[PDB]
Amino acid sequence: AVAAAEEERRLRQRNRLRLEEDKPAVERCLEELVFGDVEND
């Protein structure tokens, strides 16, 4: 079952990669409502 969990971690990572590269302008409008506008760096 270790490989099954190891298979899961890359599925999240591949899915997470796809949502940051391309974002419509509407989503950026929504994320400021849901997540706010904070910068930590």
Partner 1 sequence: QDPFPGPAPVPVEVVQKFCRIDKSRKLPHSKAKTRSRLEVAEAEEEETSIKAARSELLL
Partner 2 sequence: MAEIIQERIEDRLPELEQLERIGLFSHAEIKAIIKKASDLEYKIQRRTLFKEDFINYVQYEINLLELIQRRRTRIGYSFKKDEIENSIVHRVQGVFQRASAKWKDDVQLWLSYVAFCKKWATKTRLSKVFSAMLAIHSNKPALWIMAAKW
Residue 13 contact partner, candidates partner 2, partner 1, none, CB within 5 to 8 A by sort of partner: partner 2
**Cα–Cα distance list, 34 to 18, 29, 37 (Å):** 20, 9, 9
Q: How far is the C-alpha of 15 from the C-alpha of 10, rounded, in Å? A: 8
Interface contacts to partner 2, rule CB under 8 A: 11-16, 18-19, 26-27, 30-31, 33-36, 38
Tell me if 17 contacts partner 1 by CB under 8 A. Answer: no
Binds 3: which of partner 2, partner 1, none (CB < 5-8 Å by kind): none
